[PDB]
Design a protein around this ligand. Structure first.
Ligand SMILES: NC(=O)C1=CN([C@@H]2O[C@H](COP(=O)(O)OP(=O)(O)OC[C@H]3O[C@@H](n4cnc5c(N)ncnc54)[C@H](O)[C@@H]3O)[C@@H](O)[C@H]2O)C=CC1
Ligand SMILES: Cc1cc2nc3c(=O)[nH]c(=O)nc-3n(C[C@H](O)[C@H](O)[C@H](O)COP(=O)(O)O)c2cc1C
Ligand code: SF4
Ligand code: FES
Lengths: 63, 430, 213
């Protein structure tokens, strides 16, 4: 009942420092490739004093 | 002036401390209270702040912060939000019972202090947070507030000065951590009494998010006397940056445990031998003194001989003035059991919000229980010292420091006694 | 001493509870003590008033407070469980609290505790079978110079000896409420050996007033 496969490229994971190096490596080896852009978290506005606002909805009910 | 103490009765701010005179408005008005208050309310906020900061009055809560700067932090134009003066009448520190006397016997002095302080920083109202256990004191304060309201001293057009001011009383529900100013602010708002993080300071965001100044009962009740008698009169007592008088509660193994007002730079030996009638068994029977309640490190007999009960000299004795609560233990006292009971009190009274106090104070409680039994080794003594150093300075509020300090004092001054205890347990139980 | 709630026939959400109309007026005054938009600041006094009316807090006063203040019931549960003055179990008619902190421990408070224990025939944390007394042990109560001392409901009994606390318990069993004060010679907080301070009459108004005021 083990998991059998016939794909030699099943565990092939390659690491590249930048996107263009990976693109050039894929294009050099004749592999049709797709590229997904890097998703970064946008900066937030953090305030500890917003938990105790006088008239805003951002008051905390407890702590 | 080098020697301090032996205060005359004419220089005492807190007359009728013992309750031998009338505590109501008629008796208080004959003792100088509510006198010429319209003049102080009409002389402006900045004049009151200057009179306060010329006297050099420091905060009587225990931190010892200067009062003039702290009160002038709210001397700014308002941005549509009201401003609040909040009086800390919790007094949960063991050994400290002065604020109970001030509330129970001189309530009108507290109300006049609330009005003068609120005029000094433009407060819309006043919220007095009394201890939940002080039901009779709270009812006395409510009676006095009703008498002041009915006489026109507070409320609409307070004292005929055109200033509008209300005084409210909020009763607690039995939590020592609610004595902390930010935890007090959170408890007034109907939440759990857990302290906030600073910044924001209460002058920026306080109760209901409004600007707020939290002040002790003792540092509020003296303010009308400061504005009336003058700042130089208050500064004439005590040393530099230790000006004025102070209420001391002497308790423990002493002949006459009592609350008494005295000059700020009084010697501890003179204070004990004069006002409290000396310790039991004479001065040679003294073993240790905790000078500022349970939040301060203790000092042995060899330090209390030549020490002065102000902020600076007690700081230089690697302890603190605290709330000026002198707890005295003689030679018939297990010091380890006393400090263990203190740590047990701190474990029971801990809000548990932030990690180091919540875990470490229970850890210290278990370690000191084994120390009392003697089931340990000196490596655990050094480990407890390191744990106490790890708790202190890494917490949200100052209860963690107040639980770390007594163990550090006990270790530093009585390591041989602890070591003898564990070695006699090891040689008896094996 | 459990901070979780389990449904019982004595304590269930269907247990009847409602405020009296005079207590409704008192609740209105308490709410009017606070700014508009911050009605939740009155959770503590209204819950204390509910405990004062009932004697303890089942889970029907908590829901009633949450309903009349428009706050979530979880916040009322947090408030009730955080503070030690609120009773979530039915205590007796006289709730004796003995302070055993170090300034009271130095003045032999455990003698008072064992005196109460052998007078009532119970131990700490237990209730008498006739539901008249409850004996627990508390922290400092702000009467440290009047140590040793106990608190029975609102009243403070200070400077007690075993004979004095036995007299207090015997008088409480007879139905008469004693005087809430120290049983020694002193009245409130003065030294026992006379007044070492404040022995002069106070000077009165206009004494020591600075010029220009
Ligand atoms: N009176 C009592 O019952 C007890 C007193 N204490 C004592 O209280 C003290 C700890 O209390 P805390 O108020 O937490 O400590 P403390 O360091 O912070 O602060 C005292 C006051 O000064 C204000 N403050 C200080 N620096 C400021 C700045 N840069 N800007 C604005 N405001 C500033 C704070 O807001 C606070 O109101 C200790 O000395 C401890 O011994 C401890 C336990 C019980
Ligand atoms: C755990 C803890 C408990 C405190 N309890 C009180 C108290 O009961 N009464 C008090 O006046 N200050 C108490 N304080 C000190 C306050 O944080 C604050 O310094 C004080 O209320 C006002 O200081 P002031 O004397 O300069 O006006 C406590 C502080 C901590 C950390
Ligand atoms: S030090 Fe203790 S009492 Fe203070 S905030 Fe942290 S958990 Fe709460
Ligand atoms: S230590 Fe018992 S009343 Fe304070």
């Amino acid at each position: 009942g083990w998991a059998s496969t016939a794909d030699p490229l099943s565990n092939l994971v390659l690491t590249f420092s930048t996107k263009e190096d990976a693109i050039a490596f894929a294009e050099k080896n004749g592999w049709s490739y797709d590229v997904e852009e890097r998703k970064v978290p946008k900066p937030k506005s953090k305030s500890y004093g917003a938990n105790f606002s006088w008239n805003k909805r951002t008051r905390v009910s407890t702590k | 002036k080098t020697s301090f103490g032996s205060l005359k009765d004419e220089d005492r701010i807190f007359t009728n401390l013992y309750g031998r005179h009338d505590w109501r408005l008629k008796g208080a008005q004959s003792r100088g209270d509510w006198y010429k208050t319209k003049e102080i309310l009409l002389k402006g906020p900045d004049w009151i702040l200057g009179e306060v900061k010329t006297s050099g009055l420091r905060g009587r809560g225990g931190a010892g912060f200067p009062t003039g700067l702290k009160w002038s932090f709210m001397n700014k134009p308002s941005d549509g939000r009201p401003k609040y003066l909040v009086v800390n009448a919790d007094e949960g520190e063991p050994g400290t019972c002065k604020d109970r006397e001030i509330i129970r016997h001189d309530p009108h002095k507290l109300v006049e202090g609330c009005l003068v302080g609120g005029r000094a920083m433009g407060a819309r109202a006043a919220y007095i947070y009394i201890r939940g256990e002080f039901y009779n004191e709270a009812s006395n304060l409510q009676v006095a507030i009703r008498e002041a309201y009915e006489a026109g001293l507070i409320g609409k057009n307070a004292c005929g000065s055109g200033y509008d001011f209300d005084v409210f009383v909020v009763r607690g529900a039995g939590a020592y951590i609610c004595g902390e100013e930010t935890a007090l602010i959170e408890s007034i708002e109907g939440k759990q009494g857990k302290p906030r993080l600073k910044p924001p300071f209460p002058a920026d965001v306080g109760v209901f998010g409004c600007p707020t100044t939290v002040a002790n009962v003792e540092t509020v009740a003296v303010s009308p006397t400061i504005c009336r008698r003058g700042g130089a009169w208050f500064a004439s007592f005590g040393r530099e940056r230790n000006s004025g008088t102070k209420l001391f509660n002497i308790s423990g193994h002493v002949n006459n445990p009592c609350t008494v007002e005295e000059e700020m730079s009084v010697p501890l030996k003179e204070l004990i031998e004069k006002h409290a009638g000396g310790v039991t068994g004479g001065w040679d029977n003294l073993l240790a003194v905790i000078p500022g309640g349970s939040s301060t490190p203790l000092i042995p007999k060899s330090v209390c001989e030549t020490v002065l009960m102000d902020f600076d000299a007690l700081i230089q004795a690697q302890t603190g003035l605290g709330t000026a609560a002198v707890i005295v233990m003689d030679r018939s006292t297990d010091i380890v059991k006393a400090i263990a009971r203190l740590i047990e009190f701190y474990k029971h009274e801990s809000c548990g919000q932030c990690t180091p106090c919540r875990e470490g104070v229970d850890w210290m409680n278990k370690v000191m229980a084994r120390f009392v039994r003697g089931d340990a080794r000196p490596a655990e003594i050094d480990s407890l010292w390191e744990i106490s150093k790890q708790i202190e300075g890494h917490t949200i509020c100052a209860l963690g420091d107040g639980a770390a300090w007594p163990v550090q004092g006990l270790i530093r001054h009585f390591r041989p006694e602890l070591e003898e205890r564990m070695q006699r347990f090891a040689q008896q139980h094996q | 001493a459990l901070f979780v709630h389990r449904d019982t026939p004595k304590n269930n959400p269907e247990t009847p509870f409602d405020f009296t109309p005079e207590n409704y007026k008192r609740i209105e005054a308490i709410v009017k003590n606070y700014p508009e938009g911050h009605k939740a600041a009155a959770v503590l006094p209204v819950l204390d008033l509910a405990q004062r009316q009932n004697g303890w807090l089942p889970i029907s006063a908590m829901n009633k407070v949450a309903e009349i203040l428009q706050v979530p019931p979880m916040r009322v549960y947090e408030v009730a469980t955080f503070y030690t003055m609120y009773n979530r179990k039915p205590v007796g008619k006289y709730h004796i609290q003995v302070c055993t902190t170090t300034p009271c421990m130095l003045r032999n408070s455990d003698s008072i505790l064992e005196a109460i224990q052998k007078k009532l025939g119970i131990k700490v944390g237990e209730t008498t079978p006739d539901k008249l007394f409850t004996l627990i042990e508390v922290e400092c109560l702000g009467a440290c110079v009047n140590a040793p001392m106990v608190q029975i409901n609102d009243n403070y009994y200070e400077d007690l000896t075993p004979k004095d606390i036995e007299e207090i318990i015997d008088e409480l069993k007879a139905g008469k409420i004693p005087k809430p004060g120290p049983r020694s010679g002193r009245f409130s907080c003065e030294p026992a050996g006379g007044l070492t301070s404040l022995t002069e009459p106070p000077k009165g108004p206009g004494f020591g007033v600075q010029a220009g005021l």
